[PDB]
Swiss-Prot record, chain B:
It comes from Rattus norvegicus (Rat). The chain holds residues 1724 to 1812 of 2750 of the full protein. The ITPR1 structure has a large solenoid CY assembly built around the central helical bundle made of the C-terminal domains from four ITPR1 subunits. The solenoid scaffold includes domains responsible for binding of ligands and regulatory proteins and is connected via an allosteric nexus at the cytosolic-membrane interface to the transmembrane channel assembly. Six transmembrane helices from each subunit form the central ion-conduction pore. Inositol 1,4,5-trisphosphate-gated calcium channel that, upon inositol 1,4,5-trisphosphate binding, mediates calcium release from the endoplasmic reticulum (ER). Undergoes conformational changes upon ligand binding, suggesting structural flexibility that allows the channel to switch from a closed state, capable of interacting with its ligands such as 1,4,5-trisphosphate and calcium, to an open state, capable of transferring calcium ions across the ER membrane. Cytoplasmic calcium released from the ER triggers apoptosis by the activation of CAMK2 complex. Polyubiquitinated. Polyubiquitination targets ITPR1 for proteasomal degradation. Approximately 40% of the ITPR1-associated ubiquitin is monoubiquitin, and polyubiquitins are both 'Lys-48'- and 'Lys-63'-linked. Phosphorylation by cAMP kinase (PKA) enhances calcium release. Phosphorylation by PKA increases the interaction with inositol 1,4,5-trisphosphate and decreases the interaction with AHCYL1. It comes from the Eukaryota. Belongs to the InsP3 receptor family. It is found in: Endoplasmic reticulum membrane; Cytoplasmic vesicle, Secretory vesicle membrane; Cytoplasm, Perinuclear region. The gene is Itpr1. This is Inositol 1,4,5-trisphosphate-gated calcium channel ITPR1. Homotetramer. Homodimer. Interacts with ERP44 in a pH-, redox state- and calcium-dependent manner which results in the inhibition the calcium channel activity. The strength of this interaction inversely correlates with calcium concentration. Part of cGMP kinase signaling complex at least composed of ACTA2/alpha-actin, CNN1/calponin H1, PLN/phospholamban, PRKG1 and ITPR1. Interacts with IRAG1. Interacts with CABP1 (via N-terminus). Interacts with TESPA1.
Amino acid sequence: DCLFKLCPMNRYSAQKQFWKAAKPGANSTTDAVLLNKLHHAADLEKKQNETENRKLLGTVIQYGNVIQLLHLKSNKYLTVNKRLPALLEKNAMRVTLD
Amino acid sequence: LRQLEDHKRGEALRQILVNRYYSRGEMSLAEVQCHLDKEGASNLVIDLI
Amino acid sequence: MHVDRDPQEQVTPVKYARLWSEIPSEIAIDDYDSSGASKDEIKERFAQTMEFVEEYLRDVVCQRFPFSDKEKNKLTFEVVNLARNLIYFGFYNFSDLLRLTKILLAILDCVPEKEDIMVMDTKLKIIEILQFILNVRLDYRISCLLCIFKREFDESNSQSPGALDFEHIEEQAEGIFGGSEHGGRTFLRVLLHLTMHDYPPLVSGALQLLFRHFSQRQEVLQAFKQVQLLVTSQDVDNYKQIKQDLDQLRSIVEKSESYNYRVVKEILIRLSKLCVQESASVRKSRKQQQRLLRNMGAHAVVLELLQIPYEKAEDTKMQEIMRLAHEFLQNFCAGNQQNQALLHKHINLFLNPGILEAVTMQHIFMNNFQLCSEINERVVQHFVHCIETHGRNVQYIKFLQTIVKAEGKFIKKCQDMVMAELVNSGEDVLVFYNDRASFQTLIQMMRSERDRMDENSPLFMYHIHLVELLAVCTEGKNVYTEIKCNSLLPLDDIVRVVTHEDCIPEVKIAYINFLNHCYVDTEVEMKEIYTSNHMWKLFENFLVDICRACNNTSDRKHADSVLEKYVTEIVMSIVTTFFSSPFSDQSTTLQTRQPVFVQLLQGVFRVYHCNWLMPSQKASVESCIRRNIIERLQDIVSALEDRLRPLVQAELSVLVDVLHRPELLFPENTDARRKCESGGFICKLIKHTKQLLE
């Protein structure tokens, strides 16, 4: 359970755009051209995100950079979301796995 | 006629002030900048930034 | 020894808050409102002294034409120190220091090496008093401006038009500013001479004085804009405590770290007590009289305190100030829309917390109509995901009951703002109840204890007690969505029988007004008959409860409200006499007439008002058989700022001309001009400019 694998910084630019545009809030706006190109851009961004992880394979880390922990047996990064407080301690900031 | 009468009265006030407060050399943009650099206006900017 | 500040103190001449008692007088520089200085006990002790400095300076301008550094300056410094200290305590008329300065300027222009410190200090004191004299003619000019404004306005007064005033503003503007033939042309010559010098801090004051001489019209316009804060002709202290508390507030906003902290709570209490302004009164002749008076600019000062420079959000000294500041800000915009629309531009500060900063939005939107109808696609939709992920807030949930919901029927276009959250909320925060809602929830609420158990925080049922928000938004008259709202709704006919299983008065009130708003909405409702035959049963067993509560001898309050709420149902759409809706047969007509008369009898017999008694009688009977100066000063300052365009031409051009003028008949000599004109005046100007950053 306890093993965590280290990672470099992962850019989330088009992925967050796709997650924002893919959830129908009020207008339920869908597009055969805009959403398809947005999904293609997000996939290309994820691919070029992965292609530099193998480039940064042996590299020491100093105190002060972003480190992006990854759970090994779950293949699930642990995240801290600003909006949602903790369930038990009701003055806190909850951690999850995404 | 809004921007013209204001220009006329501004020019009149300017001329009144000029003849109140008063071989003149020629002026141009090409000469005032090198004159200001000769007196050292570059150093003021490069030290103030 | 003579300026020991026993009877007096230094007073600035640019003071504000003028009155109506001295402005009807149009006199020149000879006389003022005070007509001099303090009383006749101290002026004779200095009258023989005042002539001494004038005679000494008139001798100095006589035989000190080249210069003096031979201990004569060792007396001129003391005499100008005495002169400066007598200027600042206000023992002069304007006709005297003008005479002093028209000869004082003539003693310097009679024309990196180290020089004498002594004359440096003398010149510093004299440029300080030259800085002072420009600040007293400003007050005279402003005084003359509103004096002539009052006399021309009251010459053509239409109150107990303005076109006659507009033909004089340009005349006086071109008369008293320019177009003459007040030092003159030689005023600037000594300023340039003092600017071209060594490197003192004196040249900073001289250059500030030079920039003060120019740019005169825009600064007198700004001062005249600022000084118009007229009050009801008393002003003995009324503006004074607000001003000194604002200055006290000026030192406790930037850094609170702790002598400054102990003042904040007290000064916020004092400001809130001044702002509430006898709320138990009529709130018209006392609140509105002083309401515009702190609208002089004291709006963002509290917001700068509220901008949280410190972020220690633990259990600490935050809560001693923030609740009080929030309460003061609620008292700031409770009057009308003038402050409400002004604070409406700062709605980006009260978004995320939902606990203390949501009370601002909660209370600011009481009864406005043209401000809360301009809500964009971002304000109310910010709280769609803030209802989730933060629990259910009883304090917050009353806010959207006011901004959007209803005063009767509020509006149709904001129904898409308020109803689209139901389909956007995948959590479906609006649930009805569970299967154990009969007694496992309602036995603790008011069957246990009254008085709302220390301000209405149950976290469970008031979130479902405030479902009148869901009830009356589109059920008033809107035909936006009927199927969409009713699909996720608690399916009205089913939820009636769990209400009669165990009756709770507040939930009963919410259910009956929800059902009443549902029924009287539209005539295009598809199903009516089985909604009509079943509402007869609830009407019967609720009239039974009304008759049961009627036996109480005016010892209840919920029943009276319930009866009034049910009065509209009786006065609502009439009953039907089709196959369904049995037409008030023996089982139906025997309870809607006999038992309804007693219901109104208690109200008539009690102290209840007749506003709702009449509808019951009509429905029961029917159902049986079946100070202009504030705008004036704004107009004047608008017309005064209309002429700003020629000011730029009259200002910038003469500035760039006189900076192109170092040498033009200055004394037109030879010895004092080859140092003056060598391209070195601007050199020394920018050499001093880089040294003033520190």
